[PDB]
């Protein structure tokens, strides 16, 4: 069995590289962030442009949704994160404390906390209500490429150009585990929180068993030597691994067999970001500044 993702919509409007696309947990919306300093909201099902959210003074590297689909958080080169009310487009809080570009961000499942990763080599944990920094983790010895909460928010996983993935106890900020050392460009937990998916800048994705601390699966064939490209667990139909690539394609692998099952063609630059819809067999992909578009794809499985 293989998926049959086909192009449904091309979403134009960003004037520089797209950096990140994310579906709202309720499946209604796609949010995109860009080097153009803007967040854009789009209909997940009709691709219809909804609104622009503005206020960052420099480019945005990442955006993430609260669990109720009402709030966004953005990570910017202006060294801040901003918490946004999606309905009003208003900036509710500016999260200050990082000393360099903020690269990655995520809410916990409760959405009382935000985790951030920065070029300043720290991971910060923030109170959503107050906008205050609760904890600063001296997490890494190079820029932090990704941060992600597990299923209940009890753990954070971080990755860095220093070649490490680290698992952190959210409550205490203490490191529970460190996983050659090529730069780690992306990491996230599996939906069940038992596994970690990690990208390294040697054109390799690895599935790690967190409990055992050992590599279970490797996914190759794509190009990733430069950019922090997002990767995804696709779980709505077949059990796939999804990633962008520096050869301008979306790669889809069989999680169990590690075989490439589809390559999506259409982008005219690096596919930096992919997202999987929470309920439908729908992928969003976004590309860098030769392309600047988002594409919505639909599969029967
Ligand atoms: C250096 C690089 O990859 N620049 C392209 C724009 C940033 C993309 C991005 N990836 C992540 C992974 O967590 C967050 N943001
Ligand atoms: Cl996703």
Author numbering: 31 to 209, 213 to 334
Article excerpt on this structure:
WDR5 comprises a 7-bladed β-propeller fold, each blade composed of a four-stranded antiparallel β-sheet (the WD40 motif). Cavities on each face, namely, the “WDR5-binding motif” (WBM) and “WDR5-interacting” (WIN) sites, are the interfaces key to its scaffolding role. The WIN site is dominated by a conserved arginine pocket, where the guanidine headgroup sits in a “phenylalanine clamp” composed of Phe133 and Phe263.
While binding of the butylamine was tolerated (28, KD = 350 μM), it also enabled the synthesis of a number of amides and carbamates with substituents aimed at more completely occupying the WIN binding site.
